Amino acid sequence: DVFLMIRRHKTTIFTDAKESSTVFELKRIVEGILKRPPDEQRLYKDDQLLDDGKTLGECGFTSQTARPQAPATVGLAFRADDTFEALCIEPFSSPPELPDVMKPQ
Amino acid sequence: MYVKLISSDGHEFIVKREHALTSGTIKAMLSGPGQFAENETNEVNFREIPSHVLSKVCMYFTYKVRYTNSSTEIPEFPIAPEIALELLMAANFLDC
Amino acid sequence: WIPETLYNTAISAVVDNYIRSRRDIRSLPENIQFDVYYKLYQQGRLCQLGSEFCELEVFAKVLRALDKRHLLHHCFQALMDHGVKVASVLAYSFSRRCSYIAESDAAVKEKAIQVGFVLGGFLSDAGWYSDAEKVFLSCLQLCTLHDEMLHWFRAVECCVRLLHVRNGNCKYHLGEETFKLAQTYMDKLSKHGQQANKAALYGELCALLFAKSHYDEAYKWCIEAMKEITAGLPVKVVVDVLRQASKACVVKREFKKAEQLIKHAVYLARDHFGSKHPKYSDTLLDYGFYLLNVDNICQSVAIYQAALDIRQSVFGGKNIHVATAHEDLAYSSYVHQYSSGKFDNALFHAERAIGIITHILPEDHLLLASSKRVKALILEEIAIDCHNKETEQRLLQEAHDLHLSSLQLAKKAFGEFNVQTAKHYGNLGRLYQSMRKFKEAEEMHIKAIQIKEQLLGQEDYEVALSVGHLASLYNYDMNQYENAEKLYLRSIAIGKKLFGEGYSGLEYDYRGLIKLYNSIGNYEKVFEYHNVLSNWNRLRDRQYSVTDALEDVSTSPQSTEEVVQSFLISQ
Amino acid sequence: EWIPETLYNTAISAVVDNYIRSRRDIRSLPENIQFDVYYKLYQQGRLCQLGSEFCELEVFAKVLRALDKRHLLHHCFQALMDHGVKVASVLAYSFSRRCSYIAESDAAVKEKAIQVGFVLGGFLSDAGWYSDAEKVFLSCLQLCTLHDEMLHWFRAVECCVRLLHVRNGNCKYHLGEETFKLAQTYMDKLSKHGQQANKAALYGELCALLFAKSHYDEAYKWCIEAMKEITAGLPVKVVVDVLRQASKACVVKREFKKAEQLIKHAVYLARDHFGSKHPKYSDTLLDYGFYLLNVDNICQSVAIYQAALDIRQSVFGGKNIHVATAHEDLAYSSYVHQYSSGKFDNALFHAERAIGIITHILPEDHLLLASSKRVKALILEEIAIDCHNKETEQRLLQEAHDLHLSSLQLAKKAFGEFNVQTAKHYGNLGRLYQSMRKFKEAEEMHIKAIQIKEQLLGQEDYEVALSVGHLASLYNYDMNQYENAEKLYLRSIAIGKKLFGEGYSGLEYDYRGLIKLYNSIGNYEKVFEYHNVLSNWNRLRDRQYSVTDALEDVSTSPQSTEEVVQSFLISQN
Amino acid sequence: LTRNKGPAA
Amino acid sequence: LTRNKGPAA
Ligand SMILES: [Zn+2]
Numbered sequence A: 001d002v003f004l005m006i007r008r009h010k011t012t013i014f015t016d017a018k019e020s021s022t023v024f025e026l027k028r029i030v031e032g033i034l035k036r037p038p039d040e041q042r043l044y045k046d047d048q049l050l051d052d053g054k055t056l057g058e059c060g061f062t063s064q065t066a067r068p069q070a071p072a073t074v075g076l077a078f079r080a081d082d083t084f085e086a087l088c089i090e091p092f093s094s095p096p097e098l099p100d101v102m103k104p105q
Numbered sequence B: 001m002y003v004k005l006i007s008s009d010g011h012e013f014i015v016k017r018e019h020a021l022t023s024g025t026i027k028a029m030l031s032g033p034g035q036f037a038e039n040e041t042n043e044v045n046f047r048e049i050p051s052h053v054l055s056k057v058c059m060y061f062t063y064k065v066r067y068t069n070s071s072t073e074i075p076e077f078p079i080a081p082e083i084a085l086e087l088l089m090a091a092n093f094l095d096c
Numbered sequence C: 001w002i003p004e005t006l007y008n009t010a011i012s013a014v015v016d017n018y019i020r021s022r023r024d025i026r027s028l029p030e031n032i033q034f035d036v037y038y039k040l041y042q043q044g045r046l047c048q049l050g051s052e053f054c055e056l057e058v059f060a061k062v063l064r065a066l067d068k069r070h071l072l073h074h075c076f077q078a079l080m081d082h083g084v085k086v087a088s089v090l091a092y093s094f095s096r097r098c099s100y101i102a103e104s105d106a107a108v109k110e111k112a113i114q115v116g117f118v119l120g121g122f123l124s125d126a127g128w129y130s131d132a133e134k135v136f137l138s139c140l141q142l143c144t145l146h147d148e149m150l151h152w153f154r155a156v157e158c159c160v161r162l163l164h165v166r167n168g169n170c171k172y173h174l175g176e177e178t179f180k181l182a183q184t185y186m187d188k189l190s191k192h193g194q195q196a197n198k199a200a201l202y203g204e205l206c207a208l209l210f211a212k213s214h215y216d217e218a219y220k221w222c223i224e225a226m227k228e229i230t231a232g233l234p235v236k237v238v239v240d241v242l243r244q245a246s247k248a249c250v251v252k253r254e255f256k257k258a259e260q261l262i263k264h265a266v267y268l269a270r271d272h273f274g275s276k277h278p279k280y281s282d283t284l285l286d287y288g289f290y291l292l293n294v295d296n297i298c299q300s301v302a303i304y305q306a307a308l309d310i311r312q313s314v315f316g317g318k319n320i321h322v323a324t325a326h327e328d329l330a331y332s333s334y335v336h337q338y339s340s341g342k343f344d345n346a347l348f349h350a351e352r353a354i355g356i357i358t359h360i361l362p363e364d365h366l367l368l369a370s371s372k373r374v375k376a377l378i379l380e381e382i383a384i385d386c387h388n389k390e391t392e393q394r395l396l397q398e399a400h401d402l403h404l405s406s407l408q409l410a411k412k413a414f415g416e417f418n419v420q421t422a423k424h425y426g427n428l429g430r431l432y433q434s435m436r437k438f439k440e441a442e443e444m445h446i447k448a449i450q451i452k453e454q455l456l457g458q459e460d461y462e463v464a465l466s467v468g469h470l471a472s473l474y475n476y477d478m479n480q481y482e483n484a485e486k487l488y489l490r491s492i493a494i495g496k497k498l499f500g501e502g503y504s505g506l507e508y509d510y511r512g513l514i515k516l517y518n519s520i521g522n523y524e525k526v527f528e529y530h531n532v533l534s535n536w537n538r539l540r541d542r543q544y545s546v547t548d549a550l551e552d553v554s555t556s557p558q559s560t561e562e563v564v565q566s567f568l569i570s571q
Numbered sequence D: 001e002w003i004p005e006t007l008y009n010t011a012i013s014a015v016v017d018n019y020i021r022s023r024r025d026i027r028s029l030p031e032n033i034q035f036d037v038y039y040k041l042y043q044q045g046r047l048c049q050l051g052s053e054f055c056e057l058e059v060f061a062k063v064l065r066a067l068d069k070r071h072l073l074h075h076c077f078q079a080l081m082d083h084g085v086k087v088a089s090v091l092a093y094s095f096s097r098r099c100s101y102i103a104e105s106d107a108a109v110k111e112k113a114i115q116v117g118f119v120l121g122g123f124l125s126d127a128g129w130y131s132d133a134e135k136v137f138l139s140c141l142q143l144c145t146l147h148d149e150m151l152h153w154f155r156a157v158e159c160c161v162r163l164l165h166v167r168n169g170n171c172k173y174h175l176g177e178e179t180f181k182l183a184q185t186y187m188d189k190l191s192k193h194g195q196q197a198n199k200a201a202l203y204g205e206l207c208a209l210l211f212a213k214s215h216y217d218e219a220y221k222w223c224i225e226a227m228k229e230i231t232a233g234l235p236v237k238v239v240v241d242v243l244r245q246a247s248k249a250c251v252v253k254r255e256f257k258k259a260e261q262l263i264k265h266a267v268y269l270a271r272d273h274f275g276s277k278h279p280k281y282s283d284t285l286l287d288y289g290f291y292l293l294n295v296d297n298i299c300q301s302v303a304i305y306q307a308a309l310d311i312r313q314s315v316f317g318g319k320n321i322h323v324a325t326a327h328e329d330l331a332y333s334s335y336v337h338q339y340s341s342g343k344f345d346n347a348l349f350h351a352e353r354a355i356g357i358i359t360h361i362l363p364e365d366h367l368l369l370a371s372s373k374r375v376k377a378l379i380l381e382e383i384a385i386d387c388h389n390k391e392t393e394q395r396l397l398q399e400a401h402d403l404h405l406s407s408l409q410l411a412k413k414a415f416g417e418f419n420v421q422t423a424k425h426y427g428n429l430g431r432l433y434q435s436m437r438k439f440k441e442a443e444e445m446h447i448k449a450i451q452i453k454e455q456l457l458g459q460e461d462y463e464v465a466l467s468v469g470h471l472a473s474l475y476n477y478d479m480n481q482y483e484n485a486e487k488l489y490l491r492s493i494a495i496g497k498k499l500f501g502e503g504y505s506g507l508e509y510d511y512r513g514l515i516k517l518y519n520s521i522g523n524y525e526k527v528f529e530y531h532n533v534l535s536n537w538n539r540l541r542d543r544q545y546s547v548t549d550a551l552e553d554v555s556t557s558p559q560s561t562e563e564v565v566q567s568f569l570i571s572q573n
Numbered sequence E, F: 001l002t003r004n005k006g007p008a009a
Helices: A023-033 B024-029 B052-066 B084-094 C006-016 C020-026 C032-042 C048-054 C056-063 C067-083 C086-101 C106-125 C129-145 C149-165 C172-190 C197-212 C215-227 C235-251 C255-273 C278-292 C298-312 C320-336 C344-360 C366-383 C389-413 C421-434 C440-455 C461-478 C481-499 C505-518 C523-543 C560-569 D007-016 D031-043 D047-054 D056-063 D069-083 D087-102 D107-127 D130-144 D148-170 D173-192 D201-210 D216-228 D236-251 D256-274 D279-294 D299-315 D319-335 D345-354 D355-361 D367-386 D391-414 D419-435 D439-455 D462-479 D482-500 D507-521 D524-542 D564-570
Strands: A004-007 A010-012 A041-044 A073-080 B002-006 B011-016 B041-046
Touching: A004 A023, A004 B052, A010 A023, A010 B052, A010 D056, A023 A041, A023 A073, A023 C106, B002 B052, B011 B052, B024 B084, B052 B084, B052 C006, B084 C006, B084 C020, B084 C032, C006 C032, C006 D087, C032 C048, C032 C056, C032 C067, C048 C056, C048 C067, C048 C086, C048 D047, C056 C067, C056 C086, C056 C106, C056 D087, C056 D345, C056 D439, C067 C086, C067 C106, C067 C298, C067 D056, C086 C106, C106 C129, C106 C149, C106 D007, C106 D345, C129 C149, C149 C172, C149 C197, C149 C320, C172 C197, C172 C481, C197 C215, C197 C235, C215 C235, C215 C560, C235 C255, C235 C278, C235 C560, C255 C278, C278 C298, C278 C320, C298 C320, C298 C421, C320 C344, C320 C366, C344 C366, C366 C389, C366 C421, C366 D439, C389 C421, C421 C440, C421 C461, C440 C461, C440 C523, C461 C481, C461 C505, C505 C523, D007 D031, D031 D047, D031 D056, D031 D069, D047 D056, D047 D087, D056 D087, D069 D087, D069 D107, D087 D107, D087 D130, D107 D130, D107 D148, D130 D148, D148 D201, D201 D216, D201 D236, D216 D236, D236 D279, D236 D564, D256 D279, D256 D439, D256 D564, D279 D299, D279 D319, D299 D319, D319 D345, D345 D355, D345 D367, D355 D367, D367 D391, D367 D419, D419 D439, D419 D462, D439 D462, D462 D482, D462 D507, D482 D507, D507 D524
Parallel strands: A004 A073, A010 B011, B002 B041
Antiparallel strands: A004 A010, A041 A073, B002 B011
16 A cells, blocks of 8 residues: 655645556546546656556555655646646745754854 | 645645545535535635645645554654644644 | 544654744644643653743743643642742742832733732642732732722732632731731722622631631621622632531531531532532532531541542642641541551551641641641550550650640640640640540640630530540549549530430440449449440441432532522521 | 862853853853763752753763763763653653654664664663663664665664663563564574674673573573673673673572682673773672672672662662662672571661662562562561561561562563572462461472472572472471471482582571471480581681682782683583 | 540541 | 571562
8 A cells, every 4th residue: 555645736646556556547546636637647756757557566656665654756747738748846835944953153 | 535725835735535524624614615616626725834734734634544543553643843833733723 | 543643743743852942832822832831741851841830921821721720730730749849930920020010001910910810829729828829919919009999809809819828828817917908998899889799708718717716706707608699609609608608517516507508519519610620629628527527437538538539630749738638538537447446547648648748838837737636646546556565655755746746836826725726735635644644634634625615615516525535534544433424424415415326426435434334333324324335336337328428419409599598597 | 278170160160050041052062061061050959950951862962972971971860860850761752753753864864863872772771761771772773674784784783682681671571582583583684694793792681681581591501602702802891791691690500610700700890991980890799799699608798789789879879770779689688698697677778778769660560679579578577587576577477478479470470480480489488478377378388489499490409409498497397297307408408518518508597407306306316416517517607707808809800801701611511 | 445536637 | 597598589
């Protein structure tokens, strides 16, 4: 059982899937959520594309690095006029950086 | 079965509806005039909660739903030291 | 197992980087700050918690959480056991801010009083009357300046509380002038076309005069307090007035009239406050007082132990309220097990009370004298029930030291012609009878009888006990049988008139009377007193079938108006 | 002379008195300055300002890096734990929570956290908070088991060696075997690739576990293995620990000749490398006193324990488990020493100080508390049979019955039904029932103690001799089965003479019982025979008795390492 | 048991 | 005395 975050720009999908599940099943999930056919989607893991026939465990999504308390980011892009934009995962807001207590004045 | 938890920065965390109803406040937001969103997912606006805090809240939702009533040993939720203060006010406000 | 709440997880994660967020926790919502500080207490970080609870900036936001106040009463206690003098530091901080704010407008000063009222009420609830009195004195000083009606109302509301904190600290001499000042403000407020509900003030004065052993004045003022009970009064005030009026009725030999008062007080406390509240514990403690003074001791222990368990779970360890519950339960277990000799539990509670009081109160305090006297009473009977004479001469010497300390404290504070010093003299007479000092025992018992007959009528419970003690000294030891005969007869008359034929001390009185008439030659009277004693034992065995006192009140027995009106029409 | 105070110590006093406002800048001071500020805070009595800074892993890591001044840090930490603040639990929880957030990070920060955890867990194991050091070492273990590498295997096997020590001291023996199996797994993995880890400390810890579990033979085997795996490059702590545990396994295996050299060399190493005021030297003295008490050197065994307590009480404050163990060992040795005198005032004082400490810091269901109860009961019961009162005697018998029953239940729950210490409890109950004037149950208790100590240990051991002596004293005085009493007296005398020679101090009571038995049965010639035997025994007792202190026998050793170890190893055949 | 109990706390 | 010492601590 593997937990992911599909991060099409500002959207974030907290879906769950099995390791034995294929990438095309994940695209079907995104189809069920974003109403986009699987041919329109291109999934990216760490700026590396995922083949449709590859299983989720094949691409590097194990239940040890994509646990529910820290899911693994999975990029996604949508086809725009017979093309495909690059991944544009916008970063989350930077937390207020707490200063180190041992930093000298 | 999916709800779009829009954050203050415009981030749209699409989480499963069963997951989001863990928190009492989102359950209250999705009850009444807030459930009139006919367009599939119910967009919940969170103009106070930032994206980095709402993301950890959604991760807590999918963590508590998965790890509920489980006989196995349960790891604690990882909360960063710099985010604990902001997540604490969002945990009170959301009643999660 | 169920997953831990994100609230609790974030609390655990904000405590851990405590230095990186110490100044940011104070900016949290007021119901998260207390949860963070309770996590500091739970984690054992009492040293980091003391540095935060000692600031009135931080403690004010903690006192406004009322659901989780019973938690705070534990945390605030733990620091006072940790060695952090949180109560005195908070009182000093409040006095300093009052000194700095006294030269300001009445709008801001009223907010400082309201912070003062909740803080002083917390310190008096927790038992720190010596430190709650400073806060209430500062509030009274704030109210004294402006002479408008609101300031007079706040001043009388702080003098009905200043009287309470000067009664738990045993400062009745200051309590009299505090009540005089409250009466002055009440008269001034009445002269301005407004009436203040003088029920709490009169109840506190009843408690003062009963603690000062002025049972006639205490009864008069409790009647005047119960006259002023209305429907709009807070439940705390109604409960306090009912409780103090019950004690006054009990000590004025009105057991049939105090029963309804104390049962309704216990019902009110268990209804509003709950079964685990310190006010419910106070009502249980004085219900046990009533039951102990109506010869219902066999279940009185079941009520003090219920009262102690509530106080020991809310107020932690070394607290004066736990100490009072211990010294009260130690005396009941002394009485309940007087015929059994198993005073190991009674002594355990008695030395626990002194162990608490000597830590938190000075050696020159009245409330230490009552704890010492209970342990001294328990040490008397343990000494006369052991076998080694070295123990019989060491335990009795310790009891002598304790009784002399109690007598000198009660004589310094109350005086020489009071009832507490009279019963101290009676206890000294009992102890000297145990120590084979028969002449001095006779002198002490004569002094006790003289003082109690001068004040407590002639057919009262206390004078009956002192007469029984002197008569047992004359009969069993001094062999002055003709003198002991009349005293046994008077003790029997009082015991039958007050408690009927089921009184527990009637056993000792009948046994002494049997030996009295056996050693003089009235043998047919000795036989008739054997059959009278057998009838008494059968009657007590029949009377043993009494249900627990926490089930007598049942659910919704009466209401406040009915009980108050019944007491009022019953003279 | 009024020497002016150092500007360092004068500024330290000025800064500490300013600690209300200069509390954030001190945390950015050099480590040697920073610790001195906190030590001055302790010396001024301001533990609440000190305890609010030692409850933080970052701040406590900078004061833990002062290795020379850790003898002061231990006393400060014990004062904080006696203060009321739970610094040990707070630091353990902080480290356990903080390691999980970086367990997924790079290897450099993981190694830094592993070093911090080693330092903190070593401190908490030295102080005695084994339950609060198990969390730190467990967290270090999860840090050590995420990457497959040589150095991470080294760190993991070190984590399992140190985690075995915090589970022996916490009396968690049902987890210690699992920990040793995991350590052996990681060590075999490490040796698979051709890199052999050193197994001296691991086998020494397993020997200590098995001795504590009363498996004396397998503990002896594992200490033999540990001595076999001692090299020259080992740290002094590991060598001292292995030597101590090997000596303890040898002395309970009745090989007093090897145990003497082992523990004397251990004491020499501990005093030389560490010093005369070190916790490790105190532990070595405690094991030396155990040897002396088990080889009939009681008079200096008491003095050795008093030296062990005077070090642990000077370093580890007042209320510590290590001071508690020193108290309970000194109380039992004093009890044994004054068993023929009856002056059980200091022994009872030490035994009650060993229970008033453990009940504070350990739960009532802890095994280590049970032994501290034993040492009290054997004292209290004796005070019952020397007092001149009857009710006091009955009360003391009831209290000792409660103590032995609680200790027996704890031993049965933890260890099991059939081992050496449960049978020791049974023998204690037999003695108690003999004293409690209930000899029918005393016979059954002694019989079952004999059965357990004879089917598990040998038939010629010290404990078996002690229990047959107790049973025959029960018979020949009260139960009056004279044939069994005579045969058990002869068995006890033979075993004692074989083990400790004629100078054994435990033969006096056996001889007295046998003399009374023969006076009650006859054969006056044999009565005179055993009377002159007792006279010769007392002659040998007064002779060769004026011996020097046992801390003097451990002088500058003319035998160094790889000579005591080799002498022990080559003598095993 | 030649006497009665003690008066009050 | 009556018997021997006490077994172990
Ligand atoms: Zn402190």
